[PDB]
Amino acid sequence: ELFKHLCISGTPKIRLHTGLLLVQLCGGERWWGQFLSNVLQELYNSEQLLIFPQDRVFMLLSCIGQRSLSNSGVLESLLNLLDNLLSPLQVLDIPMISWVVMLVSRLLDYVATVEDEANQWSFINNFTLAHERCISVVQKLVLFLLSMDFTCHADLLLFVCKVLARIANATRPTIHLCEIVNEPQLERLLLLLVGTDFNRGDISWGGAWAQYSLTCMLQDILAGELL
Amino acid sequence: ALGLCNSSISVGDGLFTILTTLSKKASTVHMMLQPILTYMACGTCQLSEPLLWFILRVLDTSDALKAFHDMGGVQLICNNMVTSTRAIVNTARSMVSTIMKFLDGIHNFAPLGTITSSSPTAQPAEVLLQATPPHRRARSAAWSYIFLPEEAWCDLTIHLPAAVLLKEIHIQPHLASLATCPSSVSVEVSADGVNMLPLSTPVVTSGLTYIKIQLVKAEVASAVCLRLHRPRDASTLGLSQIKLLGLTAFGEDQVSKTSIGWLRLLHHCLTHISDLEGMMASAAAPTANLLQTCAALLMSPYCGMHSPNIEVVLVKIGLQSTRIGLKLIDILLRNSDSTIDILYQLGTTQDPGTKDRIQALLKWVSDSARVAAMKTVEYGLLMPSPSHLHCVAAILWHSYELLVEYDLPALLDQELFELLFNWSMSLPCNMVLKKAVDSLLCSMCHVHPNYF
Amino acid sequence: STAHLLVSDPNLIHVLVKFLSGTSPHGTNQHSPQVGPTATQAMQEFLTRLQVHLSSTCPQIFSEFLLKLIHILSTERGAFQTGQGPLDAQVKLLEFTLEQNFEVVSVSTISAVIESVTFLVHHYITCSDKVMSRSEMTRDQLMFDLLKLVNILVQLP
Amino acid sequence: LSSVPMLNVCFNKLFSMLQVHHVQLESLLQLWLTLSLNSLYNANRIPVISLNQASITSFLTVLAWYPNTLLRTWCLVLHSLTLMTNMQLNQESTAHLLVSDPNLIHVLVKFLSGTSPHGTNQHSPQVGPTATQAMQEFLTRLQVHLSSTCPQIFSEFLLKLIHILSTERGAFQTGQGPLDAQVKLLEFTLEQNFEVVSVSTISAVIESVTFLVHHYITCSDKVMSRSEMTRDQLMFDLLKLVNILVQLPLSGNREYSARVPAYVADLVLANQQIMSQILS
C-alpha cells in the first residue's frame, strides 16, 4: 500500500527515497520478491486503466530490484511471474511480457557484472536457481521466440534471446538444448536463422541485430553445455 | 531480378522498361499474366516496389483483372500475404526501444573504441580515432607507418566496446601528400571481436583523396581490421582520420518486401474498377486467416503509411458477404481510428447483411454490459474501447436518420437500456467509459423517446 | 563482297571475341583491361564500315553476326559475365549495336542471346558485391546497354 | 544429456536440404563455424558438430554449382573446409573423401580463378592476406591429415589443380585470379613431395606449364611501367616446381611410379614439344 500510494502519485525525490527506504527496510524479507511480482502484474497489466508514469517507476523498480538482488526471492518470483505470463504458449500480454523481460534482463546483467567483479551482450547496456522452473520458463521463451510474427517486434526478440542465454547460463547446471527444444523446434530455429525462406534480401528475419542475438544466444547455450 | 532491385539509368529501370514493352507488345493478356502468377506461386515470394508497380501497370485494364481472377490470382495473393505475415517478424521500433533508448542519423563509433596493430609501430594510431582532428595545415601526417621490405600489408585492428550495426567505413589519407595513401585496403569485421573474417576483395584507393567503403548489407560488427597495402611507389603510409559509421541496437524499400506489397495488390484489385470489385472479392473471402492477418497488420505501426488501403480492402471484404463481415466484427470487437472507420462503414452502409451486422454490434455491447454488470476470448468484454462504443452510437444514430429497410427500433430493447444504465451508474465520472455508454444511451433515447 | 566474306566465316567471331575478351597473358600488371579511346575508335570504325558495306547487300548476316558475338561474349565463361576484357570497347560495341536494326535476324539466335543476357543480368543483380567504394563509365553502363539492346530486341515483330 | 547429436542431425538436415536452394550457404557456413568454435579460430580446433559424408558432398557440389562466390563465402568456405578436415567420421578419413571427388578441384579452381562477375571495379583480383592464410591453412591441414595415410592422392590432386589452372583458358595463363593466393599455393606446393605421383599427370602438368612459360616469355608486353610480388614470382615458382618435378626418379613400369634408376627427365627429353618450348 505504501508503494502504490507513494511511488505512483508522489514526486520523484520522495519516490526514490521511499524505494530506498523499502529496500533498506524489507529488502531481506521472504515476501519481497512476491511483492515485486505482484506490483509488476497489477501495475503494467494491459487492462490497467490507471494513468501513472510507467517509465520512471519502472526505473525505480529496476533500482530496487538491483538493490534486493542479494535476496534470492526476487529473481525466483520474477521468473515465476514470467512462467505464469506466457503460459498460453504451452491470451498473450505483449507489453507486460516486454516490461518483465527487460526487468529480469537488467537484473541478470547486474548478476553477470557481480560475477565478473567477484561481453557478447554489451550492445544493449552500451544466483542459484531451481532447475525445473528455469527449464519451463526457458522452453516457453523459446516457443515465444518461434511464434514471433508481424505483431511481435525485434527489440523484444533481442531481449528474450538475451535473457534466454542469461537464464541458461545462470542455472546450475546449465540448461542444454536437448531439454529445451525437440527436433522440429530446433529445425525451425535453424531454418529461421540461415534458411532463405526468411533471410532473403535486406529484410532478413528480424534484421541483422536479431540474427546476431539468435547466434549469440545459441553460442552462449552451447558454451554453457561444453563447460 | 526485378524482385531484388531497390526503388528510387539503373538496371532496375532497364528491367522495368523491357517488362513494360513486353507487356505492351504481348498479344493476349493470359500468356503475360501466367508467368507473373507462376512467379508468385513458385517463390516466401520476392516482391519489390518496381515489381509492384509493374504488376499494377499490367493490371490496368478490366480484361486484365478478369483474366487474373479467372486463373486463380486473388487467392494466391491472399495466401502469399498470410504466409508472409506469418513469416517475417516486424523490424519497427516498438515500445521497448523507446523505453530503453534514454536509459543509457548515422553516428560515429571510432572515438569509443581502441586501436592496435600487429607490428610495433613508431607511434600509436589512436590519433586516427578522434571525432575531428584539426585538418587545416597537415604538416607531416596524423599517423605514419614505416614498411619493411618483406612485408606489404599492415593491419589496424579497432576494437569497439560494444557491437554496432556497421554501415560504412571512412578512411582519410594524408591530404597534403597522398603519395603515402594506401594502394588497396581490405576491411574485416568481427561480431564477437576475436574471429577476424575478410570483408570484400581489397578495393584500390591509390589516387583517392577520401576512402568511403559503404556496405549494401549493414553488418553487426564489434571489431574492424583495416589491412592496408603498401603504396605503389612509397615506403610510408600516412593517414589522418578513420571513422566507423553505423547505428546501435537502440539508436520505402524497408516495407515493400513485407506483407504490405500483397495488401497493395489486393487493394488495387478491389478498388481500381468497381464493376469487378464484388465477385472477385467473393474469391478473396474464403481464404484462411485473411481477416485476422489484415487486422493484425492494421494494428502494426508500419500500417501508418498505407492504412487507407488496409481499411478500404477490409470494408470491401466485409461487405462482400454477411458471414465474413460478422466474423471480422467479432475479431475487431472481441479478439484505433481505423477500427472506428471499419465499424462505421460496416454499420451504416446498406446491404442485406446490415441487419446481422448491427445485431452483432448490439450483441457485443450487451455482452460487455453484462460482463461489467457481474463485476482469452472474453478480453474484449473485460473492457471495451470507449471510442468503439461512441462509434456504435454514431452507427445507430445514422441508421435512425437514414432510410433503412429494417425495423431499427425492434432491435432496441428495454432490458439493454437497463443494462447500460446500470453500467453507467456502476462507475464514476472521471473516465470516458461513462461518456461512451451515455452517448449510446442518448442514441437509444433518440430512437426511442418512450425509453427516456 | 569482301565484307560478306569477312562476316561469313566464324574466324572473325573468334577474333572479335579474343579482342573483347581482354585476356593479356603478358600482363604482370593486370590493372585496368580497357584498350583506350583509339582502340575503341578503331573497333567502332571497323564495325561501321562493315555496316556500311553490308547495308546495301545483306544486313541480315551482319546483324546475325553481331548478335552471335553478343551471345558468345555473354554466355557462360564469357567476357561479359566474368568481367574480364576492355570495358570501353565492350560498351562501345553495345552502343553501336543499339543503333543497328535486327529486322530479319533468326529467332533461334535471338532466343539464345536473350536467354544468355537475362541469365547474366539476373546473376549480376542477385550476386552483386557486398561493399561499394565511393569516389564516369563502368559495367553498370554495360548492363544498361545490354538491357536496352534487349528492349529493342523484344519489340521486333 | 548432451544436445550435440541433435545439433548434428539438424545441421546434416540443413546441409542435405540446401540442394533445393532452401538454405543460404553463407549463413549456414558462418553459423556452423561459430557454433563449432566455442569449445578464436585455429586450424587445430576440432569442431563440436560432426557432419555427414553426404552433407559434405552436398556442400561441395552446391559450392561448385554456385557462381560469383564472394570472398565472405570464400573465406567461410576455406575455414569450414579446414574444420571439415579437422573433424572425424564414424572408417575412411574425411580428408581422403574431400580430396577424392573432383568437386574440390572445381571449388579450388573457382577460388583461384578470381572471376568476380559482381565487380564493376575489377581493379586488383588479389584476395588479401587473410584469405591466402585461410587457403594455406586448409592445404596444410589436408597435407597433415593425408601424410600418415596416403600423400599420393593429395600430391596428385595438387598437381591436377596446378595443371588445370595452367592449361589453355586457365587462371595461370589468362592472368585473372588472386595473384597472392596463386603464389602462396605455388610456394606451398614447393615444400611438398611428389614421390609416388603418376607419370601421366606429371607429364601433363610439365607440358602445360612449359607451354605457358614459353608463351609468357615470347609474347611478353612491349612496355613496362617502373615504380614486391607479381606474376614474375608466379612463373619463377612454377619453374622451381618443375625443377623439383624433373629431379624425381621413377621406378617400375614407368606409370604410377616414382618411389623416391631412370628419371622423368628422360620422359621429358623424349617429348619434343616440351624440349622445343623450353629451348625457345
Tab-separated table of N, CA, C and O in Angstrom, chain A residues 66-115:
chain	number	residue	atom	x	y	z
A	66	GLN	N	17.696	-4.275	-8.247
A	66	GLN	CA	19.147	-4.402	-8.191
A	66	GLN	C	19.666	-4.249	-6.766
A	66	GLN	O	20.723	-4.795	-6.431
A	67	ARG	N	18.943	-3.513	-5.919
A	67	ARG	CA	19.299	-3.460	-4.503
A	67	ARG	C	18.967	-4.768	-3.793
A	67	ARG	O	19.765	-5.261	-2.987
A	68	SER	N	17.800	-5.345	-4.075
A	68	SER	CA	17.350	-6.564	-3.414
A	68	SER	C	17.847	-7.833	-4.094
A	68	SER	O	17.409	-8.928	-3.726
A	69	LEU	N	18.730	-7.708	-5.088
A	69	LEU	CA	19.314	-8.879	-5.738
A	69	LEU	C	20.113	-9.763	-4.785
A	69	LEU	O	20.376	-10.924	-5.118
A	70	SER	N	20.522	-9.242	-3.623
A	70	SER	CA	21.120	-10.095	-2.601
A	70	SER	C	20.119	-11.128	-2.097
A	70	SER	O	20.486	-12.273	-1.809
A	71	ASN	N	18.851	-10.739	-1.977
A	71	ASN	CA	17.799	-11.696	-1.665
A	71	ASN	C	17.561	-12.612	-2.859
A	71	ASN	O	17.568	-12.173	-4.012
A	72	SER	N	17.350	-13.896	-2.577
A	72	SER	CA	17.176	-14.893	-3.624
A	72	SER	C	15.733	-15.034	-4.087
A	72	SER	O	15.470	-15.818	-5.006
A	73	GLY	N	14.795	-14.302	-3.482
A	73	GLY	CA	13.398	-14.445	-3.851
A	73	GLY	C	12.949	-13.578	-5.005
A	73	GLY	O	11.947	-13.903	-5.650
A	74	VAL	N	13.670	-12.490	-5.289
A	74	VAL	CA	13.230	-11.551	-6.319
A	74	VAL	C	13.341	-12.176	-7.708
A	74	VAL	O	12.393	-12.127	-8.502
A	75	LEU	N	14.481	-12.807	-8.009
A	75	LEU	CA	14.662	-13.433	-9.316
A	75	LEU	C	13.746	-14.638	-9.484
A	75	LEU	O	13.170	-14.838	-10.561
A	76	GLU	N	13.596	-15.443	-8.428
A	76	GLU	CA	12.712	-16.604	-8.482
A	76	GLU	C	11.268	-16.184	-8.725
A	76	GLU	O	10.578	-16.754	-9.580
A	77	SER	N	10.804	-15.159	-8.006
A	77	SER	CA	9.431	-14.701	-8.177
A	77	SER	C	9.221	-14.025	-9.525
A	77	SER	O	8.143	-14.150	-10.113
A	78	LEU	N	10.237	-13.332	-10.047
A	78	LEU	CA	10.087	-12.694	-11.350
A	78	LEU	C	10.054	-13.725	-12.474
A	78	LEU	O	9.266	-13.597	-13.420
A	79	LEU	N	10.883	-14.769	-12.381
A	79	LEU	CA	10.812	-15.837	-13.374
A	79	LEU	C	9.527	-16.647	-13.237
A	79	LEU	O	9.002	-17.140	-14.242
A	80	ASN	N	8.993	-16.779	-12.019
A	80	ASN	CA	7.687	-17.410	-11.855
A	80	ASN	C	6.582	-16.557	-12.468
A	80	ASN	O	5.628	-17.088	-13.051
A	81	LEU	N	6.698	-15.231	-12.346
A	81	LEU	CA	5.753	-14.331	-13.000
A	81	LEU	C	5.838	-14.460	-14.515
A	81	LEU	O	4.814	-14.435	-15.203
A	82	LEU	N	7.053	-14.615	-15.047
A	82	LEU	CA	7.227	-14.870	-16.477
A	82	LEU	C	6.565	-16.185	-16.890
A	82	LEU	O	5.874	-16.260	-17.918
A	83	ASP	N	6.782	-17.236	-16.094
A	83	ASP	CA	6.208	-18.549	-16.378
A	83	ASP	C	4.685	-18.502	-16.374
A	83	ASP	O	4.031	-19.159	-17.193
A	84	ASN	N	4.107	-17.730	-15.454
A	84	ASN	CA	2.659	-17.550	-15.430
A	84	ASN	C	2.226	-16.701	-16.626
A	84	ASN	O	1.186	-16.964	-17.240
A	85	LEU	N	3.061	-15.735	-17.020
A	85	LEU	CA	2.664	-14.739	-18.009
A	85	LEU	C	2.547	-15.340	-19.404
A	85	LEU	O	1.515	-15.184	-20.068
A	86	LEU	N	3.587	-16.035	-19.873
A	86	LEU	CA	3.467	-16.699	-21.172
A	86	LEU	C	3.048	-18.161	-21.050
A	86	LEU	O	3.505	-19.006	-21.832
A	87	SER	N	2.187	-18.469	-20.081
A	87	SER	CA	1.523	-19.770	-20.040
A	87	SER	C	0.710	-20.123	-21.290
A	87	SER	O	0.719	-21.309	-21.665
A	88	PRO	N	-0.028	-19.185	-21.980
A	88	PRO	CA	-0.760	-19.597	-23.194
A	88	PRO	C	0.090	-20.111	-24.353
A	88	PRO	O	-0.459	-20.543	-25.371
A	89	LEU	N	1.414	-20.074	-24.224
A	89	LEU	CA	2.321	-20.674	-25.200
A	89	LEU	C	2.860	-22.012	-24.713
A	89	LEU	O	4.035	-22.330	-24.910
A	90	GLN	N	2.018	-22.804	-24.057
A	90	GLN	CA	2.418	-24.111	-23.548
A	90	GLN	C	2.615	-25.115	-24.682
A	90	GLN	O	2.201	-24.876	-25.817
A	91	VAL	N	-5.119	-14.774	-23.070
A	91	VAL	CA	-4.255	-14.651	-24.237
A	91	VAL	C	-2.900	-14.080	-23.839
A	91	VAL	O	-2.599	-13.935	-22.654
A	92	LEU	N	-2.085	-13.756	-24.839
A	92	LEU	CA	-0.756	-13.218	-24.595
A	92	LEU	C	-0.824	-11.722	-24.316
A	92	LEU	O	-1.580	-10.988	-24.958
A	93	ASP	N	-0.027	-11.276	-23.350
A	93	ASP	CA	0.050	-9.871	-22.955
A	93	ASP	C	1.439	-9.368	-23.346
A	93	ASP	O	2.379	-9.428	-22.554
A	94	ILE	N	1.551	-8.863	-24.578
A	94	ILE	CA	2.861	-8.473	-25.113
A	94	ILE	C	3.512	-7.319	-24.349
A	94	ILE	O	4.712	-7.419	-24.042
A	95	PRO	N	2.815	-6.209	-24.021
A	95	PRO	CA	3.514	-5.140	-23.277
A	95	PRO	C	3.982	-5.545	-21.887
A	95	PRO	O	5.103	-5.197	-21.495
A	96	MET	N	3.155	-6.271	-21.131
A	96	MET	CA	3.554	-6.707	-19.794
A	96	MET	C	4.710	-7.701	-19.860
A	96	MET	O	5.637	-7.645	-19.035
A	97	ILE	N	4.677	-8.601	-20.850
A	97	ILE	CA	5.790	-9.517	-21.086
A	97	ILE	C	7.062	-8.738	-21.391
A	97	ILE	O	8.136	-9.055	-20.870
A	98	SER	N	6.956	-7.691	-22.215
A	98	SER	CA	8.127	-6.880	-22.542
A	98	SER	C	8.688	-6.187	-21.305
A	98	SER	O	9.907	-6.194	-21.082
A	99	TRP	N	7.808	-5.599	-20.484
A	99	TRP	CA	8.237	-4.939	-19.251
A	99	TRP	C	9.000	-5.903	-18.349
A	99	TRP	O	10.112	-5.602	-17.888
A	100	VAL	N	8.432	-7.091	-18.120
A	100	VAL	CA	9.060	-8.010	-17.177
A	100	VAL	C	10.335	-8.626	-17.760
A	100	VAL	O	11.289	-8.886	-17.015
A	101	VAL	N	10.411	-8.832	-19.083
A	101	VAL	CA	11.643	-9.414	-19.613
A	101	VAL	C	12.769	-8.390	-19.613
A	101	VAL	O	13.924	-8.750	-19.365
A	102	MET	N	12.475	-7.101	-19.835
A	102	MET	CA	13.547	-6.121	-19.664
A	102	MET	C	13.950	-5.963	-18.204
A	102	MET	O	15.135	-5.744	-17.919
A	103	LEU	N	13.002	-6.084	-17.269
A	103	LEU	CA	13.367	-6.005	-15.855
A	103	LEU	C	14.284	-7.159	-15.454
A	103	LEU	O	15.327	-6.949	-14.816
A	104	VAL	N	13.922	-8.387	-15.836
A	104	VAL	CA	14.762	-9.523	-15.471
A	104	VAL	C	16.062	-9.511	-16.267
A	104	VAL	O	17.085	-10.013	-15.791
A	105	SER	N	16.070	-8.900	-17.458
A	105	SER	CA	17.317	-8.750	-18.198
A	105	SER	C	18.267	-7.795	-17.488
A	105	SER	O	19.467	-8.069	-17.397
A	106	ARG	N	17.747	-6.676	-16.974
A	106	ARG	CA	18.580	-5.756	-16.201
A	106	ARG	C	19.105	-6.420	-14.932
A	106	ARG	O	20.281	-6.253	-14.571
A	107	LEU	N	18.251	-7.190	-14.250
A	107	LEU	CA	18.694	-7.891	-13.046
A	107	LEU	C	19.764	-8.931	-13.366
A	107	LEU	O	20.729	-9.094	-12.610
A	108	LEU	N	19.629	-9.624	-14.498
A	108	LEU	CA	20.626	-10.624	-14.861
A	108	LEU	C	21.919	-9.987	-15.355
A	108	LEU	O	22.992	-10.573	-15.184
A	109	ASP	N	21.853	-8.793	-15.951
A	109	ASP	CA	23.088	-8.074	-16.257
A	109	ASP	C	23.794	-7.622	-14.986
A	109	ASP	O	25.028	-7.644	-14.920
A	110	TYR	N	23.034	-7.215	-13.964
A	110	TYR	CA	23.665	-6.912	-12.680
A	110	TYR	C	24.279	-8.163	-12.058
A	110	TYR	O	25.358	-8.099	-11.456
A	111	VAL	N	23.605	-9.308	-12.200
A	111	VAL	CA	24.147	-10.576	-11.709
A	111	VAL	C	25.447	-10.921	-12.431
A	111	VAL	O	26.434	-11.331	-11.806
A	112	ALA	N	25.469	-10.746	-13.755
A	112	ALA	CA	26.669	-11.030	-14.537
A	112	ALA	C	27.807	-10.081	-14.180
A	112	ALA	O	28.967	-10.499	-14.108
A	113	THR	N	27.495	-8.803	-13.946
A	113	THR	CA	28.518	-7.852	-13.518
A	113	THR	C	29.068	-8.198	-12.138
A	113	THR	O	30.277	-8.067	-11.903
A	114	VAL	N	28.203	-8.645	-11.224
A	114	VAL	CA	28.651	-9.064	-9.898
A	114	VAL	C	29.556	-10.288	-10.001
A	114	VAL	O	30.605	-10.358	-9.349
A	115	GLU	N	29.181	-11.258	-10.840
A	115	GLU	CA	30.024	-12.434	-11.044
A	115	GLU	C	31.331	-12.080	-11.746
A	115	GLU	O	32.343	-12.763	-11.550
